[PDB]
DNA sequence: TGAGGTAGTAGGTTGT
RNA sequence: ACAACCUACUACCUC
C-alpha cells in the first residue's frame, strides 16, 4: 500500500551526461531536419545551437563555426531547455523505432484498442521532461483517440453525398490540421486549399457523432483507475527496457524514488448554528447562519401549458413547497404581488419577440428574485435563446438575480405524485404539504430542491454557512482569466473572513481591454478588498492569501508595494487545474491502485493534491497542482488553506473540486464574457451567479 | 438550465 | 519551431 505518482528520476545527472554542440553563425530548423534525415539519429536544436547524442557522420554540408563534445552548463537556461528537448526526441525516437508508434497529434499513438461501428479507438500517451536542480524527470500521461475508418472515397463509392459544410481533418504527422481523384475546395482560414479527396475524413468528435456508438465510446474511454495506471505502467516499462541514454530504479514509480512527502489533510468542520461535520448533514435537520426575508417573483409562459400538460396551480404549489421547507430552516419567502396585473403574457410569439417586450417588464420584477419557468426548446433554440436573453438582460442591465426551471424538474417531480396517487388539490393544506414533503425526502429530487432552493438563497443574499475553525490566513483573494477571442474577461472573489463570511465578488469590472491584468486594477482589487475586510471586522487582516487560475504572469513587485504601506504578510500561490499527471496507492495484498481524499504530495514549494473522490463510472480523480510562489508562511499552512476553502459551496450540496477563490472566479469570468452580471456594491453574500 | 464530477474533441496563449 | 498551460463545446455518470 504505497504512493505512486505517473513520473520517474534518472539515476543520471544533467551535468554528467556526454553530449555535442554545434554552433553556427528558427535558424537551424531545416538543418537539424537535414540531418536527422540523413544520419538517422536523434538530435534537437535552439536559436543558433544544436545538440545531439552521439557524433554525425553526413554533415550535409553547412559551416558549423564550433564543434564541441562536452556536458551541460546547468547553471544557463538555455543549456537546461536544449538537453531537455533531447532527452524527448530521444525518447520519441526510441518509441517509434523498436515500438509500433506514431506521432499523431501532441502525442504518440499507439495500438488499437476497440472498434465499434465505422469508430477506431486509440491508445495514446505524451511525455514531458524536466530538469529540477540537477535532475532528470519524466512525466507520462495517458489518452485515447477516435478515428473513423472510411475515408471520403468510400463513402462517395457507396453514393453518399458530401455536405459543403463538413469538418474534414487531414492526416499527415503532427501537423494534423482540421478543415475519384476529386478535387476539394477546404478553408482553413481565407484562403482556400486543394486536395484530392483522398486521406480526408470527417472528425470523430461527439459533437458529429450519432447514437448508438457515443454510449458505448462513453464506455470505452471511461476505464478504472486501476486500468489506467496499469497500462501506462505497463507501457512505460516496455519503452525504458529498451533506452539506453538514460538508467533508472527497477520500481522508478514511487514518491520515495521522487522527491515527494505525502501530507494527509482532514475534513473541517461547518457552522451552521453549531458545529456540523458536513455540509450534508447541516442541511438537512438544520438551520442556517445568516437568515432573512426574501420575496419572490415568478414568471411563466404559455408554451410550458400549451405543448406541455402544467398548470399555473402545479407551479404556484411548488413554489409553496419551497416555501415551508425553506421556513423549516429559519427562512420565509414571500410571492409578490406586482406580477398578478400582467396575465397571460410570455406567450410564443413574446419569445420571437423578446428583445422589444421587456422594457415594461422592469418595475413589476424589481427588488426581488425572479423564478423563472421558460421552456427549454426556448431555453437552447437559436432562433429563441431564451436563457442567454433572459440573463443579459434581467442580471446585465437592471441587476434583478433569477432562477431558470426547466420542465425535466416539474414531470420529474411529478411522476412521483402520480406514482403514488397524490395529484389533487392541496393547496394550504398542511398536511398533504407534510407528506409532500416527506416524500420528497425519500428520492434523489431532494437534492435538486436543495440546490434550487441554494441558488434562491445566494442569489436573495443569505449566507448558508460558515467554517467552524479559523484558517492560518485572515482573507483570500481569488483570480481567474478567460480568453475568448480578443476581449477577454477577469473573475475576482474577496473572501472576507477567516472562516468565509463575505463570499461576495469583487465590486469591480472584470473586463480586460489588454490581454492580461493590469497593475492599476490589481491595486484596486486588494486596496478595496482591505477595506473592505476593515469596514466588516473593524481590524486590519494580518495576512491575505491570493490564488491565481493558472501561472502568475502579473508582477511580484506591485504586490509588496502596496501592502508595505500597510504592514500586511501576503502569498501569490497559483493553482494549476490540468496537472497532465496522476496520484494512486497501490495495494500489494491483491494488485489494485485507488485514491483517497485530501491526500498531498509535496516537493519543494509544489505539491498535488487530491481534492475528489468520485466513482468508478466517473472515471479517476483528477488531481490539482499548487506551486507556492512566496515563502512567508509554511507550506504546510497554503495546503490546508486550499483544501479546506472547498469546502464553501454555498451554492450547491455537491462538492466542488477547485478552492472557492477559483471556482467562482471563472463564473464570474464567464459570466462578464457573455455579458450577465453587473457589478454591485454592498456587504453581504453576493453571487448572482450561480 | 438542480448541481457536481470526468474524458473525448477542437482552438488560443504567452514565452524563449 | 517548441514548451507550458488556459478556454469553449458535446458526452456519458452519480446525487
Ligand atoms: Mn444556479
Redesign the pocket.
Known sequence: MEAYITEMVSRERANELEVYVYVFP?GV?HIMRAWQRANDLPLA??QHTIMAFSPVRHMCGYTPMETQKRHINIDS??ER?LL??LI?NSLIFTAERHLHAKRV?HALRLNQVQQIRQVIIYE?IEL???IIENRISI?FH?????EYVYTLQSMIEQGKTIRPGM?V?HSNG?????YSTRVIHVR?KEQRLSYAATLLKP?????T?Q?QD??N???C???S?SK?MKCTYRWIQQLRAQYRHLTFAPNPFTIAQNGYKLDQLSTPKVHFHRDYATVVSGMKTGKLYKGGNIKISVLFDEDFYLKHHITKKDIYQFIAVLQKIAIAQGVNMTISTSTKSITGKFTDDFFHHFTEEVEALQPIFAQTTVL?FIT?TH??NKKTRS??LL?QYFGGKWDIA?????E??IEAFQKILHKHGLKNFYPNDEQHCLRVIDVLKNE?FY??VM??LL?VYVKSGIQPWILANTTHSDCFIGI???????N?AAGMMNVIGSQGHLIQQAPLNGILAG??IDDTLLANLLKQMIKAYHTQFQRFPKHITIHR???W?EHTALVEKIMSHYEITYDIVE??????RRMAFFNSVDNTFSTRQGTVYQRGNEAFLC??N??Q??????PI?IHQVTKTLPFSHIIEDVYNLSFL?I????????PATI?YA??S??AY?RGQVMPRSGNQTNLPF?
Open positions: 528558427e530548423y536544436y535552439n537556461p538555455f531547455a531537455e528537448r524527448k497529434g495514446a514531458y521532461v524536466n512525466g495517458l489518452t485515447h483517440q477516435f469538418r481533418v503532427r501537423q494534423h490540421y482540421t482553413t472528425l470523430c468528435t461527439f459533437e457523432m447514437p457515443v454510449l465510446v462513453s464506455k474511454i471511461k476505464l483507475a489506467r423563472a427549454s431555453l437552447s436563457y442567454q440573463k433569477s432562477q431558470v426551471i426547466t425535466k424538474t434523489s437534492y435538486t440546490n434550487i441558488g481567474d482569466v478567460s480568453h475568448e477571442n480578443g477577454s490581454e492580461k487560475d493558472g501561472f504572469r493553482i494549476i487545474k490540468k496537472p497532465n481534492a475528489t468520485p466513482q463510472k466517473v472515471g479517476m480523480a483528477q497542482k459551496h451554492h450547491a450540496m455537491n462538492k466542488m473540486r477547485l471556482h471563472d463564473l469570468a464567464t464574457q450561480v
